[PDB]
Design a protein around this ligand. Structure first.
Ligand code: HE9
Ligand code: HE9
Ligand code: CL
Ligand code: CL
Ligand code: ZN
Ligand code: ZN
Lengths: 315, 315
């Protein structure tokens, strides 16, 4: 006696594909790797409660490969299995509202993700992949499980792995529309003279070497090929924010001089991030935890600043 | 009795750091994770033959974090351990010269890497990270082990994993200077009218949906939000190449009409890439293998074309 149920398959959870499945065969025998809201059901036979439900599958025909690429903007063949694996964990995380922002309760070394998510909610940024658009909208409303699982997938991080905020923001910026952003730098060597550089997109809003946007505008010392120290300074900036990053160092954050920042305590093998936001006072958001202070000093690794248009007065 | 040797530590294999190591303690007890030309020596005690040798370590102080970021352009904390793990394998791969290009002898599902490397040698592209500049220069001369291990690290792929050429090229392009590249598209819906789009950088040279650069210039059918099919066509192109990608489909490559292409045989779970180059005839490079033909038809997934400046005659 042959028994079947109707189910839907999908890659994007919007475009459904009708399937009739034999209840005597695993999902894996019929579709390949199959997932039900993050749970791997590849080795499970259909249940009556599955009738009418949506399962994710891998893009195993041309229709699904086009739907997957258009939604996620990747053709990495392990992407959907990494997104599903992460989602099976992130759907059980808690996303409390802390000082008006979606945060994440600490679990599975997710501190870098909490500070990234809190940061995104304070800067002007629009994603390009529909998957990130749709999930980020949900995350802002407080249901951030899909958004967090997609960040893990896009970054090639598994739940529990130690992440870097700067690296995470770089991946998210690579999937954002930053095409309007432009940076002009000048590098002055007393031996080699001057060299100007123009940067665009992600490389226009990120700098690694100093936390201070004012110091970047006055000049920072860097090696020259000739062996002297050259001075690099900001000639021109067009962007709605900038991100200044550095290896973690004791640094003073003053109310009203920055938007938000990331603090890292620990070492290269394990540590903990916290988020500092400058509002009516300085709030320190640590997952679900919140404290406040008029002054802040800590091992800061990233600082975000508001921008629109800057032009140097250095001739 | 306390015995020591001098060794050097590094993150970039250029900047050396003098160390004195106790021969009674593992490298791991003294430096953390340590590698000798890709081999993990973390759990090994120093040998006399190690005196004067360079070991890679993880960026565990501010000097190393700056050297690592400046050389690799990443702050992913697992990067160097992934680069070292891959290199331990790639240094044993063979890199034959095939029709004047560095290829790779098949091993560990590396076909996607061989076709990517052959492609890079046929298109005008300069990398931004010194690590890729230096390794790509070595790869062009025939010593591609570092370059292949860095592609694996930057792509978050391990040796043996099934890769996608389009995805791999996207990661390499993200680390290349494509800031001059510009694409203007027009999307025409008989219901919604016209919408023009400008793309920059990587998104100016990559398109997913059609293999044909001529079809892209005449127009390709895509969904509109209103439910009709719209026509997307190329208004303007400034770049030294373009890459046209699609799910694998039988396709005819004609001598003199393209630069090179990737062919994929198999399915979403496992397959094999080959490279087709258009020179004095059509050469099919399959790792170490070479064949030739006047005509070619196969399941093509990517085609590369030469460009400088294009302007449509569609009004
Ligand atoms: C990275 O991939 C893309 O940028 C991309 C792919 C498909 C689209 O429809 C689109 O608007 C952008
Ligand atoms: C992605 O990171 C960068 O683009 C970057 C980082 C350091 C540099 O000295 C540089 O010229 C570029
Ligand atoms: Cl968005
Ligand atoms: Cl280069
Ligand atoms: Zn100089
Ligand atoms: Zn329309």
């Amino acid at each position: 006696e042959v028994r079947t149920i109707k189910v839907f398959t999908t890659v994007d959870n919007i475009n459904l594909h009708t399937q009739v499945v034999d209840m005597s065969m695993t999902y894996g025998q019929q579709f390949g790797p199959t997932y039900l809201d993050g749970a791997d059901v590849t080795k499970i036979k259909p249940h009556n409660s599955h009738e009418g439900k949506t399962f994710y599958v891998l893009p195993n025909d041309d229709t699904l490969r086009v739907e997957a690429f258009e939604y996620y903007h990747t053709t990495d063949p392990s992407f959907l299995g990494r997104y599903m694996s992460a989602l099976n964990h992130t759907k059980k995380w808690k996303y409390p509202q802390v000082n008006g922002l979606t945060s994440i309760k600490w679990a599975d070394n997710n501190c870098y993700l909490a500070t990234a998510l809190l940061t995104l909610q304070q800067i002007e940024l629009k994603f390009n992949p529909p998957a990130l658009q749709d999930a980020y909208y949900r995350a802002r409303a407080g249901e951030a499980a899909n958004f967090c699982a997609l960040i893990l997938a896009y970054c090639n991080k598994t739940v529990g792995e130690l992440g870097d905020v700067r690296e995470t923001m770089s991946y998210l910026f690579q999937h954002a529309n930053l095409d309007s952003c432009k940076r002009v730098l000048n590098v002055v060597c007393k031996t080699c003279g001057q060299q100007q550089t123009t940067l665009k997109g992600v490389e226009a809003v990120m700098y690694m070497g100093t936390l201070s946007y004012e110091q970047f505008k006055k000049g920072v010392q860097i090696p020259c090929t000739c062996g002297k120290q050259a001075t690099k300074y900001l000639v021109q900036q067009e962007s709605p924010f900038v991100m200044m990053s550095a290896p973690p160092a004791q640094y003073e954050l003053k109310h009203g001089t920055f938007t938000c920042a990331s603090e890292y305590t620990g070492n290269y093998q394990c540590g903990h991030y916290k988020h500092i936001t400058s509002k009516e006072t300085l709030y320190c958001i640590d997952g679900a935890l919140l404290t406040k202070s008029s002054e802040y000093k800590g091992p800061i690794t990233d600082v975000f600043y508001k921008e629109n248009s800057y032009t140097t007065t250095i001739k």
